[PDB]
Write a protein that binds this ligand. Structure first.
Ligand SMILES: COc1cc(-c2c(C(=O)O)[nH]c3c([C@H](C)N4C[C@]5(C[C@@H](CN)C5)OC4=O)cccc23)ccn1
Ligand SMILES: [Zn+2]
Ligand SMILES: [Zn+2]
Length: 232
């Protein structure tokens, strides 16, 4: 009923959308992994009379449910999707998208990592993102590679029309004391990568983490703090 939807409020398999700003929504779904249930976010950005999707809903059936929820709530076609790193919460569902006519994109680094690890593989390579600080335009967003953080390939997404910063899994929510799933992370470089984000997007109004509640710019400093303390 209007609050940001939370893990115990979303059964696995259902998807909810949340309006962030004009022409910007997040998508929220839940999935089981290693015997625990987690929420995860993605983004939807209006691209004229089409939609740009950022990240899958973490699995094939969740991603099919995402497409149905978009058709119900928004009713514009998803034409392109970008995955912001190689993990299943970002690419699991790419096969569903591709069979639904959506053109799927990721950096070459993400594509290689997904292929190596047996995750679903976006079709199209996003060049111009291989050096930290790189940025490219993609429809109504800017894609930015901040450096290694949660993963070596993680991208962030900025919506300039709305000053919305989608940090993906490189950014954690304010209630997190913990740095989430660090299996593929670079804890040493992560604060430097966050500082690059902070420098590049000083006018961000909304910051969306890969998992959990959106907030403001404080999510960035909080993330750096939690990562440093984890390493400590
Ligand atoms: C309190 O626990 C958490 C956990 C997370 C969390 C995050 C995140 O932090 O982005 N990602 C998760 C994943 C994803 C799919 N995978 C799995 C994997 C690849 C490795 C293979 N050996 C392990 O690594 C990774 O990230 C699964 C389960 C939970 C999370 C967020 C917040 N709180
Ligand atoms: Zn991840
Ligand atoms: Zn994640």
């Amino acid at each position: 009923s209007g609050e940001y939807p939370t893990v115990n409020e979303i059964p696995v398999g259902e998807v909810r959308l949340y309006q962030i700003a004009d022409g910007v929504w997040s998508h929220i779904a839940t999935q089981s992994f290693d015997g625990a249930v987690y929420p995860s976010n993605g983004l939807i950005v209006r691209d004229g009379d089409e939609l740009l999707l950022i990240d899958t809903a973490w699995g094939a059936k969740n991603t099919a449910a995402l497409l149905a929820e978009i058709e119900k709530q928004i009713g514009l076609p998803v034409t392109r999707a970008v995955s912001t790193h190689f993990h299943d919460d970002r690419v699991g569902g790419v096969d569903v998208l591709r069979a639904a006519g959506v053109a799927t994109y990721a950096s070459p680094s993400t594509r290689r990592l997904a292929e190596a690890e047996g995750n679903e593989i976006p079709t199209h390579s996003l060049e111009g993102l291989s050096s930290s600080g790189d940025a490219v335009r993609f429809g109504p967003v800017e894609l930015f590679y901040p450096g290694a953080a949660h993963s070596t390939d993680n991208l962030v997404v900025y919506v300039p029309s709305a000053n919305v910063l989608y940090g993906g899994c490189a950014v954690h929510e304010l209630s997190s004391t913990s740095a989430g799933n660090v299996a593929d992370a670079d804890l040493a470089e992560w604060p430097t990568s966050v500082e690059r984000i902070q420098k590049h997007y000083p006018e961000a109004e909304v910051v969306i983490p890969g998992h959990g509640l959106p907030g403001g710019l404080d999510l960035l400093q909080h993330t750096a703090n939690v990562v440093k303390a984890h390493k400590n």
